[PDB]
Design an enzyme around this catalytic site. Structure first.
Site, mmCIF file in Angstrom:
data_model
loop_
_atom_site.group_PDB
_atom_site.id
_atom_site.type_symbol
_atom_site.label_atom_id
_atom_site.label_comp_id
_atom_site.label_asym_id
_atom_site.label_seq_id
_atom_site.Cartn_x
_atom_site.Cartn_y
_atom_site.Cartn_z
ATOM 1 N N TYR B 158 -2.086 113.934 -51.886
ATOM 2 C CA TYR B 158 -2.357 114.909 -52.643
ATOM 3 C C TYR B 158 -0.594 116.060 -52.051
ATOM 4 O O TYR B 158 -1.534 117.390 -51.841
ATOM 5 C CB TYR B 158 -3.586 115.669 -50.622
ATOM 6 C CG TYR B 158 -4.539 115.933 -50.422
ATOM 7 C CD1 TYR B 158 -5.605 114.749 -50.767
ATOM 8 C CD2 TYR B 158 -4.900 117.386 -49.807
ATOM 9 C CE1 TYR B 158 -6.852 115.709 -51.189
ATOM 10 C CE2 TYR B 158 -6.163 117.579 -49.989
ATOM 11 C CZ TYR B 158 -7.238 116.537 -50.555
ATOM 12 O OH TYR B 158 -9.043 117.730 -51.189
ATOM 13 N N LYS B 228 -7.414 101.676 -48.523
ATOM 14 C CA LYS B 228 -7.487 101.118 -49.465
ATOM 15 C C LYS B 228 -6.323 99.883 -49.782
ATOM 16 O O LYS B 228 -5.805 100.058 -51.066
ATOM 17 C CB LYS B 228 -8.553 101.918 -50.863
ATOM 18 C CG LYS B 228 -8.772 101.211 -52.348
ATOM 19 C CD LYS B 228 -9.611 100.652 -52.204
ATOM 20 C CE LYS B 228 -9.754 99.851 -53.168
ATOM 21 N NZ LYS B 228 -10.926 98.288 -53.405
ATOM 22 N N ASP B 281 -13.754 101.506 -49.923
ATOM 23 C CA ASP B 281 -14.851 101.301 -50.801
ATOM 24 C C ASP B 281 -16.604 100.517 -49.903
ATOM 25 O O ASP B 281 -17.788 101.152 -49.967
ATOM 26 C CB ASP B 281 -15.005 100.924 -52.110
ATOM 27 C CG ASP B 281 -13.905 99.736 -51.761
ATOM 28 O OD1 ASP B 281 -13.434 99.000 -51.393
ATOM 29 O OD2 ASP B 281 -13.245 99.108 -52.920
ATOM 30 N N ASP B 305 -10.628 113.055 -46.763
ATOM 31 C CA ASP B 305 -11.564 114.638 -47.627
ATOM 32 C C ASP B 305 -12.509 113.591 -48.092
ATOM 33 O O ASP B 305 -14.119 114.181 -48.043
ATOM 34 C CB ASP B 305 -10.329 114.798 -49.072
ATOM 35 C CG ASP B 305 -11.392 115.341 -49.865
ATOM 36 O OD1 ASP B 305 -11.260 116.069 -51.134
ATOM 37 O OD2 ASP B 305 -11.455 116.490 -48.969
#
Lengths: 414, 414
Positions: B158, B228, B281, B305
């Site tokens: 980002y 992750k 996930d 986000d």
């Protein structure tokens, strides 16, 4: 070398873009670690019963066990997690199916599922999620969901191009980025791990092409490119632009006025496929609020990973979600869940994922009738509420079956 | 220079870590583009009524309009989307609230919401999502969700460190990566856009510290670091390690045996806060299947986000989701939705997001009673089914109110 290739059985052949499948093809399978020892026996028994019933004895699969992960170290020695011959045998026999894999921590080894997909260039991760009637769901209307995910498997941040904070390497690339590239936007250059995210045109256009082609071949209503390009302009944004471009240039896409959405006329049904895009984070909301609006999905590696996991949870299919990895030369079908070591060997987990991935395998091979019998068995077992523990907890009136028994419920509903 | 600072009104002051708020503080507000022209009048009227009712006339806010986005070009000239004085005025007056912003395409300008958060170093994006009783939801049990998201705002992919495919720059970094770093893992080095993903220790430990401190100050049951890291070891994985480390080193974290989860004893309630982690996930599935298991959430930019957007959709709050950006020197409260240009000026969209962000502002300022009156008004309007179009469509028996009227419904339920 430790794989025993079957005496009866013949190799599937690729005769330029088309598989030529013998009546007794040799299919490689990797049993998997953990609960793979439970789910893979159940899949071999239902695929067998389905090709026995569909072709009345004329066809038979010659299963050939190949090795990866934890079982590969018990057979080839403690150090070899991915034998180089597994990659040759999948290459050679063209289609394979596999259970869940364990990647070790402590030995510098990268995620073996991702290493298979990159080492064989299986650039399509295909994830179909639809609701099977009568499965427990956390949402009000799971039946409105019927999507097919085309996830790019060979690029993105997932390629594992990164360096450790305070390593000489990380130091060196941060020095290159600040001095040679002039990046003034790393907040903390000291103690800083660096990941690389690539997105190329060849990489997105071969995946999007496979996605539109799927939609023409199956008369699906639309292809949605989901991306986070308002922030990542030159990778996610590049992906959406290259996908729209390939729909105009190779499929004769046309503006639905003013754009940005395109129409593709299906050269076979005459119907129009809408090519559209939605930002990834608004998409994650859209699949819950308006799932009937979406259909075929094309996305990059990470987004595809999240999208498929979220979608599979909303239809109650975390343990029955199928998946394939398709490249130009071979295909690898897989259980999409983890190894669940607690339950391993207890014959209790849902064999649903690897079985439905086997229906995708059968279908891919052209054995449509056998494939149809497996989803008929599935719908029937579930509807019969004759189910495995993970569905039975959440259900009222169910009969609890072991993993093996649910296999037999699938065959009895065939 | 084009902002008119109020004649009555006094600046909030930072007297080392603590805000010293006057009874008539000057609060800067950015109206916002699009539907900001509708929602911001409604927020000014309900915050006013709430400080009028809570402190019986003793306190009053002196609103001072500052400019960003599309309205900044109508006031300072077509070229200036983010005036340098907006950053000084937010810096100086310490707390501000803002509507949705338009970032232009075609002029090389990066997402103005993200530019405010990086230019002021507002490294905490705080997103609280809870269910307001009686709002239409797509899920069976929205009431089980009550989470607070601590999203890192200053690093990750980002930060917008990237270069265009076939640019000299992209070419140059890919050459550096392949020749000097030896990366043999970019599938397609030609026509390839490159994004950089940084994660530093100072960046994750200042965000995780703010997350545990929130959990001690509010006796929350747990802090979950979602990452992750099984794939991105040196950034997402670094984040989970640095977060566990900071919980052991600064909060006296202890193993819940064998680990990896930690206990932190709340120095005030005596209760134990579990510090745990789940892969991003699987987390996206967990929030749907077992939301009651989670509470305070700490994550990196992109994940935060997605998590906040998904969570807000499951509680029916896409248009009433509040948000703050908190740094050490100032705070910026915001409507978390887009500008919705179709509806702009029609007085019909939900002012719910900017109003609840105003309750977070009030609360942050120490004006707890005024803040409490606004969430009382909110719960009451909603329960009264006296609602705006976006909730009324999905509701049976609702009364449809314009945006302004829903403001008045909030004041009538105070």
């Amino acid at each position: 070398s430790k794989v025993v290739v079957p005496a009866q059985g013949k190799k599937i052949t690729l005769q330029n873009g088309k598989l030529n499948v013998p009546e007794n093809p040799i299919i490689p399978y990797i049993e998997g670690d953990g609960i793979g020892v439970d789910v893979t026996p159940a899949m071999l028994k239902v695929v067998d019963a389905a090709v026995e019933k569909a072709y009345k004895g004329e066809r038979k699969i010659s299963w050939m066990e190949i090795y990866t992960g934890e079982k590969s170290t018990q057979v080839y020695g403690q150090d070899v997690w991915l034998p180089a011959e597994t990659l040759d045998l999948i290459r050679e026999y063209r289609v394979a199916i596999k259970g869940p894999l364990t990647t070790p921590v402590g030995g510098g080894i990268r995620e073996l599922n991702v290493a298979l997909r990159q080492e064989l260039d299986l650039y399509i991760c295909l994830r179909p999620v639809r609701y099977y009637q009568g499965t427990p769901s956390p949402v009000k209307h799971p039946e409105l969901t019927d999507m097919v995910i085309f996830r790019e498997n060979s690029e993105d941040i997932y390629a594992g191009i990164e360096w450790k904070a305070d390593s000489a390497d990380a130091e060196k690339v941060i020095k290159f980025l600040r001095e040679e590239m002039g990046v003034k936007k790393i907040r903390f250059p000291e103690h800083c791990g660096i990941g690389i995210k690539p997105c190329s045109e060849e990489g997105t256009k071969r995946l999007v092409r496979a996605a539109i082609e799927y939609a023409i071949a199956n008369d699906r209503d639309s292809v949605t490119l989901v991306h986070k390009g308002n922030i990542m302009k030159f990778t996610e944004g590049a992906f959406k632009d290259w996908g729209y471009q390939l729909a105009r240039e190779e499929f004769g896409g046309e503006l639905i006025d003013g754009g940005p959405w395109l129409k593709v006329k299906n050269p076979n049904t005459g119907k129009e496929i809408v090519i559209k895009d939605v930002i990834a984070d608004a998409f994650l909301q859209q699949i819950l609020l308006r799932p009937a609006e979406y259909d075929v999905i094309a996305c990059m590696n990470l987004n595809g990973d999240y999208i498929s996991d979220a979608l599979a949870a909303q239809v109650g299919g975390i343990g029955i979600a199928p998946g394939a990895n398709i490249g130009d030369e071979c295909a690898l079908f897989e259980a999409t869940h983890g190894t669940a070591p607690k339950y391993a060997g207890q014959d209790k987990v849902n064999p649903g994922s690897i079985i439905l991935s086997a229906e995708m395998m059968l279908r891919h091979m052209g054995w449509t009738e056998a494939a149809d019998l497996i989803v008929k068995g599935m719908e029937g077992a579930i509807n019969a509420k004759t189910v495995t523990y993970d569905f039975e907890r959440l259900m009222d009136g169910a009969k609890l079956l072991k993993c093996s028994e649910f296999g037999d419920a699938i065959i009895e509903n065939m």
